[PDB]
Amino acid sequence: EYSLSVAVLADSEIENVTQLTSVTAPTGTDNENIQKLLADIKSSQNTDLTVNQSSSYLAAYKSLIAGETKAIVLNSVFENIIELEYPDYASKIKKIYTKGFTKKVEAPKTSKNQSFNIYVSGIDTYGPISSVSRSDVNILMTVNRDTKKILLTTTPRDAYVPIADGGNNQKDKLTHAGIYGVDSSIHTLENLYGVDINYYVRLNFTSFLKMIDLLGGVDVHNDQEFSALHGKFHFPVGNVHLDSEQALGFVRERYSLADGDRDRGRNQQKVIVAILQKLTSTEALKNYSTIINSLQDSIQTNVPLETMINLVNAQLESGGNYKVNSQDLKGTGRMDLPSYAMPDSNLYVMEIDDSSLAVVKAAIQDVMEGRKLA
Numbered sequence: 228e229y230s231l232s233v234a235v236l237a238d239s240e241i242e243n244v245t246q247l248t249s250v251t252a253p254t255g256t257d258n259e260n261i262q263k264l265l266a267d268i269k270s271s272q273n274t275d276l277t278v279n280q281s282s283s284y285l286a287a288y289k290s291l292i293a294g295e296t297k298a299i300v301l302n303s304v305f306e307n308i309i310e311l312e313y314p315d316y317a318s319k320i321k322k323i324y325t326k327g328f329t330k331k332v333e334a335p336k337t338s339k340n341q342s343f344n345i346y347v348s349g350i351d352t353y354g355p356i357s358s359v360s361r362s363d364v365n366i367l368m369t370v371n372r373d374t375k376k377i378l379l380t381t382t383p384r385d386a387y388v389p390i391a392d393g394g395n396n397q398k399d400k401l402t403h404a405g406i407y408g409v410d411s412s413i414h415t416l417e418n419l420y421g422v423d424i425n426y427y428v429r430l431n432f433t434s435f436l437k438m439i440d441l442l443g444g445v446d447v448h449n450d451q452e453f454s455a456l457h458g459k460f461h462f463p464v465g466n467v468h469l470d471s472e473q474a475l476g477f478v479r480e481r482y483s484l485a486d487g488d489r490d491r492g493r494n495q496q497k498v499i500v501a502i503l504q505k506l507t508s509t510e511a512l513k514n515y516s517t518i519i520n521s522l523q524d525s526i527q528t529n530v531p532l533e534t535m536i537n538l539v540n541a542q543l544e545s546g547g548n549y550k551v552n553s554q555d556l557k558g559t560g561r562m563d564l565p566s567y568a569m570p571d572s573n574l575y576v577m578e579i580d581d582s583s584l585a586v587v588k589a590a591i592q593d594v595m596e597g598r599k600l601a
């Protein structure tokens with residue numbers, strides 16, 4: 228669900244596309260969509276626009292506000308990219324022609340064997356799940372149902388990697404892939420780690436709060452005393468029960484932790500393990516349909532209903548717990564590397580450590596294949 232429009236400045240005398248002879252657009256990277264719009268205009272309006280190629284949607288927008296072109300094509304996915312450098316962009320423009328487009332996100336792929344990968348995307352926002360934002364949580368869960376082993380692989384939000392699809396395979400912080408869409412995040416991580424991602428789950432703050440509540444809160448073992456959300460919550464060393472608001476604080480805090488984002492990553496992992504413990508309780512398994520009903524409008528997933536039913540019932544019958552291991556991709560913070568989405572800003576990114584990448588990839592393979600972790 229996205230659209231392409233022809234946009235002009237808010238105060239333009241231009242009312243309709245027939246008044247135009249050309250439009251500025253990034254045909255180098257979004258040509259398929261652009262040509263569809265152009266063919267649509269030629270057929271409904273009998274107007275045949277020439278294209279002034281721009282290097283990107285952002286560059287087109289810049290040309291428009293600089294009075295270097297009268298009109299641009301805007302793909303709605305990229306409004307959220309323009310917004311990164313121009314937060315007021317919406318008030319600067321009007322749209323004079325709009326065409327809706329469609330695309331299904333990731334088809335799920337059923338693993339032929341005992342092992343599958345689920346990508347968990349956590350989005351930086353409250354409200355309706357359809358809201359577009361960056362993906363600040365990016366965790367791969369590798370599950371082997373034969374060995375009963377799960378590996379959580381965390382990739383830091385600032386990891387500097389080639390971003391698939393809308394990212395044009397150019398390097399940027401991983402969290403930006405989320406703005407292009409969940410399929411961009413999925414393909415980005417598939418390419419990084421060389422594995423197929425069978426399924427995804429996408430959720431935001433509002434989704435997470437609901438889930439922890441429905442589960443009765445979660446229990447974790449905390450290793451370091453800390454407080455979260457500007458002091459609102461305090462977590463002592465030891466066994467801690469987390470209600471929903473506490474859990475959200477627990478997975479968001481970074482700066483005061485001994486190891487910063489890495490410790491936050493570990494805290495997120497602790498919460499996942501805790502959620503899994505609740506979801507595999509006999510009560511939760513028996514009442515899985517109620518949980519599906521209670522979360523379906525706030526959590527997106529491509530896990531098929533039949534697959535959920537198989538996973539649940541297998542666990543119901545055989546019982547037995549999964550052993551969970553965790554790992555995180557390591558790197559070095561830098562301020563001097565360019566962001567593809569935000570070419571005018573100096574951003575903090577994490578340059579990936581190649582030795583860590585090799586170890587992380589091998590661990591994913593070991594768990595999938597039923598081999599002991601190194």
Ligand SMILES: CC(C)=CCC/C(C)=C/CC/C(C)=C\CC/C(C)=C\CC/C(C)=C\CC/C(C)=C\CC/C(C)=C\CC/C(C)=C\CC/C(C)=C\CC/C(C)=C\COP(=O)(O)O
Binds near residue numbers: 549
């Ligand atoms: C909807 C789902 C997936 C499940 C619900 C339905 C049920 C009952 C499922 C049961 C499945 C089951 C019982 C068994 C499945 C087979 C099995 C025994 C194991 C396999 C597990 C599997 C295949 C799927 C289960 C997936 C599970 C249980 C959990 C995935 C982890 C989840 C759902 C959430 C964790 C997300 C998290 C830790 C954080 C999200 C927080 C958010 C939204 C944002 C954080 C952003 C941030 C940290 C900072 C940004 O803020 P700032 O920095 O600006 O302050």
